[PDB]
Design a binder for this molecule. Structure first.
Ligand SMILES: OC[C@H]1O[C@@H](O[C@@H]2[C@@H](O)[C@H](O)[C@@H](CO)O[C@@H]2O)[C@H](O)[C@@H](O)[C@@H]1O
Ligand SMILES: OC[C@H]1CNC[C@@H](O)[C@@H]1O
Length: 1113
């Protein structure tokens, strides 16, 4: 069987515009010249996110009715550019006329007939305002750059929106308002309209009240307008309108296009407008959310609880001794981002993995989205999760359960339990509990769904699956075959449609007695709308399973007889223990809370880091697949070096060097690491340093200078294909170093900024800024990297090593000579020539509102480039200008924002949303601050900083932090500022904790891996070198008497810490009371740690594996 693709059957056209709808009149794709206007495509079971609601007020009730889409009771007629919806709501008769005019302008003309005392209308419209590709790739991201301006016109509120992030070359625009009726209130974000409560109730919260009339610049661009209320006795008529422009290079200052709007309003099509068939749902009800569990029920299902989070004495979340994290219903209804989880199969940890199976799931009944095998974008069976509030709830795998006469889609459970192997949902039903589990198999490319009635009661179910079989829903036809209870799914025309994985297939094992269809079973007349919705009806069962297999290379394996969760959980526990070298903190007395948070989080961060490495995607950032060049060089390499996964790092490095670009001899920004030849050949200015630093770190850790002699190819810039001109890794390095030498500004060793540094929002706004800026952060990184390379290469190429030392020293000299003034490292220097220089992000830049930058302060310290005086000053500057309760900030003031046009920096001046790097607390940079503090031996500050970004019981540690998912990494911390203007004005509230702060994007980040390295290597102080162990703790007094279990060179040992201010030496290490000999480490800021030979360490370990570490702060 060939599954066809969904095509929207209602197609409205007019000059430069194609607006399509599903048969219920739900929005599908609204396109004006290449610009997609809506944010979300409707689906055949939920409809679309937009609507028009009639509300009727009575003395004892408020009622609300959708007028459009499949949830209205509307009949529909269509012409070539017009739709007419007709129906009744109570005893009001209505018509809604949709018009698509030639002017990139549309209208919803409403007509109401009847008799009632008080009514109003709410207009509701999700908005994208980007190319179709940008919208599809990430709606949240696109929304962040969509800047809303609010005005009063003739008929109250009008909302004008400019997309600040370039779409092709264009800055597109929307305007929305009302005509013939006043819009008395407005909102601009989906969180305002639907509310968090929607995730349980399935009712938009705003429908019960008044819109707030505030512009919230967040991730769910969603315009709502509320009319003045009116009585009806007779007929009343009025319209809403929209305007789309593909390019509006200026900032928005006023209502525009008034004359065009008037011309468009006179527009009517000449053609006939004829009835069309509207399909209707059959015995399908509203969604089903579980009732909440009370304290007694929680206690019964979860008797053993740790790290309990409570708010007003109600339990929100907790951890278990089995290493699970459990989230109770009330917590999800208070987190702006939805609780979720990524499952990933195990792989051989000595090699770069391939064909790794992954799946995403979310608390609110998204049981399996984005099931993939290998490439997370292309090698996909199930559609991605989108949005935040589950308005569109048809993606991936979903479950309907028959309650009374009606199938009801499961949404919000009573509890949601995550472990590294699986997720479990607990739904309270009438006198029963339904348990759903989606879990990864060990050693097999499988995810398994199990459904179990606890009371062994029988139910009817429909399990739906929005198929892709490729990167996107609705894009390609699918080949589906069935042999008994085994389905096989694969792309049609696999060689051609997939040159690179021509054998890509999937299989599903389905229950014995089930029937198979598309969405036809949902509809009264059995009409198929979406043929790629794979529906499985399972009648009168108390349990069932669906087993899902992925094969990137067609190595099909038979299904097991029994699929047991517990066995997988046990195998994954061991794999994750080994991955972190059996890390475990203990004490004989009460373990300190900080240590208890580290034991709980270490395995969660290891999982996040391993995903970031092997299966590169996140929760919000679903579109990844590739390795970022600077990304793989940080989180994964630092994680793997810390835990002794050296063979893996070697293989990563070989793969990485194979992706260096022929000719330019830099790296791409990102590249696929599988068989897909895709990369981004244009790079930022810092990227080149990262593979150089990483190979040098690898060489220092292992002594494996052999890597330098490996013969390794390059890739071509344009088509990302192998060049078949291999050279030694040493020569790869020499070529990359030449690109660095050629960046010196003339007369100096100042490294030109080029395409930007670490901060992707700080790309230069023009070519003069690109050529003439110098990033002090980049300068410091260069110095550091070239010094590290010098050492790594010293034994192999004496001469190149001397040239590397000269470079590093000249860079060092220029750093001190040009980038420091009055003891303050400037964030940037602008140097057109010796005669025309200007500091930026420095106190001398008195024109600017920004006078301090974090990044150079931390990197200069990490590298031991900053002398003690400068390091000490750096820390005072942080304390006085950058330090907040939620961590250290990237600058002392926000980047400029003046309506979206860039002057100096690109995305930093374009983002309308206070979030991501624009939040100024980008957690990765805070982690480098921790690293800097550790380098300086400042244990109190370091451990305090470690805790400020630890999501476990975060609200207890940082009182102004809003709670968020406690078992996942959060990438940023942003003040609750609705727009950039308020953010600038009341910025200082961040320093003093007088504004709440909330978490950013989850999971996908270098953070988890570099956090793990801070914990183990820098703070606990256990680091590895060539046949040596380095012991160099930076611990507080509360770690006195605490022990770390850690596997060293394959031997489990126990490091017990003693903090002793009265010692003579800085450090002493003892086993069986014998002092271990070794040499002192080099550190310009404090007394160094100790280097102990591996044979010596291991010999002591054989007699007594309890090492006692005496350290003086
Ligand atoms: O997706 C928005 C996000 O993109 C960030 O950049 C990407 C990076 O995180 C990822 O590792 C690679 C490979 O998939 O693609 C991109 O370079 C960017 O740094 C952020 O500013 C944006 O928020
Ligand atoms: O701009 C800060 C960071 C954002 N995510 C990708 C990283 O490579 C980058 O440094």
């Amino acid at each position: 069987g060939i599954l066809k693709t969904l095509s929207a059957p209602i197609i409205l056209e007019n000059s430069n515009s194609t607006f399509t709808f599903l048969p219920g009149g739900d929005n599908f794709e609204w396109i004006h010249e290449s610009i997609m206007i809506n944010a979300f495509q409707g689906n055949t079971l939920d409809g679309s996110t937009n609507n028009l609601y009639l509300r009727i007020y009575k003395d004892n009730s408020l009622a609300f009715y959708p007028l459009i889409g499949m949830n209205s009771k509307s009949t529909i007629k269509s012409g070539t550019s017009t739709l007419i919806f007709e129906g009744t709501a109570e005893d009001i008769s209505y018509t809604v006329t949709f018009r698509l005019t030639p002017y990139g302008i549309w209208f919803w003309d409403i007509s109401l007939s009847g008799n009632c005392n008080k009514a109003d209308i709410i207009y509701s419209q999700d908005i994208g305002v980007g190319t179709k590709g940008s919208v599809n790739s990430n709606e949240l991201y696109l929304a962040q750059y969509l800047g809303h301006s609010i005005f009063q016109g003739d008929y109250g509120y009008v909302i004008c929106s400019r997309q600040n992030m370039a779409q092709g070359d264009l800055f597109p625009y929307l305007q929305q308002g009302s005509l013939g009726i006043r819009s008395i209130a407005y909102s601009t974000d989906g969180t305002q309209f639907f509310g968090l409560s929607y995730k349980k109730t399935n009712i938009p919260e705003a429908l019960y009240g008044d819109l707030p009339s505030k512009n919230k610049q967040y991730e769910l661009a969603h315009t709502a307008l509320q009319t003045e209320a009116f009585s009806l006795s007779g007929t009343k008529q009025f319209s809403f309108y929209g305007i789309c422009k593909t390019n509006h290079p200026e900032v928005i200052r006023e209502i525009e296009y008034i004359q065009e709007l008037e011309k468009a309003y006179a527009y009517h099509e000449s053609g006939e407008i004829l009835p069309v068939n509207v399909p209707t749902l059959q015995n399908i009800g509203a969604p089903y959310a579980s009732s909440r569990w009370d304290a007694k029920q929680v206690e019964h299902y979860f008797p053993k609880r740790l790290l309990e989070e409570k708010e007003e004495e109600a339990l929100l979340s907790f951890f278990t001794p089995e290493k699970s994290h459990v989230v109770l219903q009330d917590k999800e209804l208070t987190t702006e981002r939805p609780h979720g989880h990524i499952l990933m199969t195990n792989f051989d940890v000595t090699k770069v993995p391939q064909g790794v199976v992954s799946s995403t799931n979310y608390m609110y009944g998204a049981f399996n989205c984005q099931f993939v095998v290998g490439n997370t974008t292309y090698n996909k069976l199930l559609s991605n999760h989108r949005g935040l509030l589950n308005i569109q709830k048809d993606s991936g795998q979903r479950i309907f359960i028959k309650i009374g006469d009606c199938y009801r889609q499961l949404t919000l459970p009573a509890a949601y339990e995550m472990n590294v192997a699986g997720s479990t949902w607990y739904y309270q039903l009438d006198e029963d509990v339904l348990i759903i589990t989606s879990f990864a198999m060990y050693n097999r490319p499988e995810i398994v769904l199990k459904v179990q009635s606890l009371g062994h009661k029988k139910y009817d179910f429909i399990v739906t699956h929005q198929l892709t079989v490729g990167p996107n829903e609705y894009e390609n036809e699918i080949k589906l075959t069935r042999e008994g209870n085994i389905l096989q799914l694969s792309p049609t025309d696999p060689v051609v449609t997939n040159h690179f994985y021509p054998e890509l297939s999937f299989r599903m094992r389905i229950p014995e007695d089930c029937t198979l269809s598309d969405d036809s079973i949902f509809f009264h007349n059995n009409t198929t709308i979406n043929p790629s919705l794979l529906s499985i009806e399972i009648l009168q069962k108390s349990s069932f399973d669906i087993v899902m297999q992925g094969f990137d290379t067609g190595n099909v394996i038979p299904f097991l007889d029994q699929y047991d969760y517990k066995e997988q959980l046990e195998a994954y526990r061991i794999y994750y223990d080994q991955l972190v070298c059996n890390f475990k903190l203990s004490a004989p007395d009460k373990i300190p809370l900080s240590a208890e948070k580290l034991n709980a989080i270490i395995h969660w961060y290891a999982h996040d880091a391993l995903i970031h490495f092997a299966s590169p995607h996140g929760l919000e950032q679903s579109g990844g697949a590739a390795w970022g060049t600077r990304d793989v060089c940080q989180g994964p390499i630092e994680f793997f070096l810390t835990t002794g996964h050296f063979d893996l790092v070697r293989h990563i490095l070989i793969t990485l060097y194979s992706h260096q670009i022929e000719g330019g001899f830099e790296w791409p920004q990102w590249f696929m690491f599988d068989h897909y030849p895709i990369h981004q050949e244009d790079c930022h200015g810092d990227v080149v340093f990262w593979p150089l630093k990483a190979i040098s770190d690898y060489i220092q850790a292992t002594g494996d200078t052999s890597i330098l002699n490996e013969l390794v190819d390059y890739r071509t810039a344009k088509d990302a294909l192998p060049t078949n001109q291999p050279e030694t890794i040493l020569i790869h390095i020499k070529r990359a170093v030449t690109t660095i030498k050629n960046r010196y500004l003339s007369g100096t060793a100042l490294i030109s900024y080029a395409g930007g540094d670490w901060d992707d929002t700080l790309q230069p706004a023009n070519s003069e800024l690109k050529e003439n800026l110098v990033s002090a952060w980049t300068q410091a990184l260069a110095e550091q990297t070239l010094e590290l390379l010098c050492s790594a290469i010293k034994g192999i190429d004496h001469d190149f090593s001397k040239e590397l030392s000269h470079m590093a020293n000249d860079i060092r000299t220029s750093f001190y000579q040009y980038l420091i003034k009055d003891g303050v490292i400037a964030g940037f220097l602008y140097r057109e020539s010796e005669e025309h220089m200007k500091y930026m992000l420095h106190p001398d830049d008195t024109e600017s509102s920004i006078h301090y930058r974090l990044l150079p302060l931390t990197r200069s310290i990490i590298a031991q480039l900053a002398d003690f005086k400068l390091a000490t000053r750096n820390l005072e500057i942080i304390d006085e200008h950058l330090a907040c309760p939620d961590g250290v900030r990237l600058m002392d003031h926000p980047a400029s924002y003046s309506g979206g046009i860039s002057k100096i920096f690109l995305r930093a001046e374009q983002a309308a949303n206070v979030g991501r790097e624009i939040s100024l607390q980008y957690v990765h940079a805070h982690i480098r601050y921790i690293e800097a503090l550790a380098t300086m031996g400042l244990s109190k500050k370091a451990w305090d900083a470690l805790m400020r970004i630890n999501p476990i019981l975060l609200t207890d540690y940082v009182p102004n932090a809003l709670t968020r998912q406690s078992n996942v990494y959060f990438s940023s911390s942003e003040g609750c500022f609705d727009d950039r203007y308020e953010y600038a004005k009341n910025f200082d509230k961040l320093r003093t904790g007088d504004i709440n702060v909330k978490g950013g994007w989850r999971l996908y980040s270098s953070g988890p891996g570099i956090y793990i390295r801070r914990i183990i290597a820098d703070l606990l102080g256990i680091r590895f070198g060539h046949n040596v162990i380095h012991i160099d703790p930076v611990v507080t007094k509360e770690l006195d008497g605490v022990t770390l279990q850690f596997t060293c060179f394959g031997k489990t040992v126990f490091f017990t810490y003693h903090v002793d201010d009265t010692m003579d030496k800085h450090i002493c290490v003892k086993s069986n009371n014998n002092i271990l000999p070794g040499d002192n480490l080099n550190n310009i800021y404090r007394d160094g740690g100790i280097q102990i030979a591996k044979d010596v360490f291991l010999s002591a370990a054989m007699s007594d594996n309890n090492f006692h570490i005496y350290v003086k702060n």
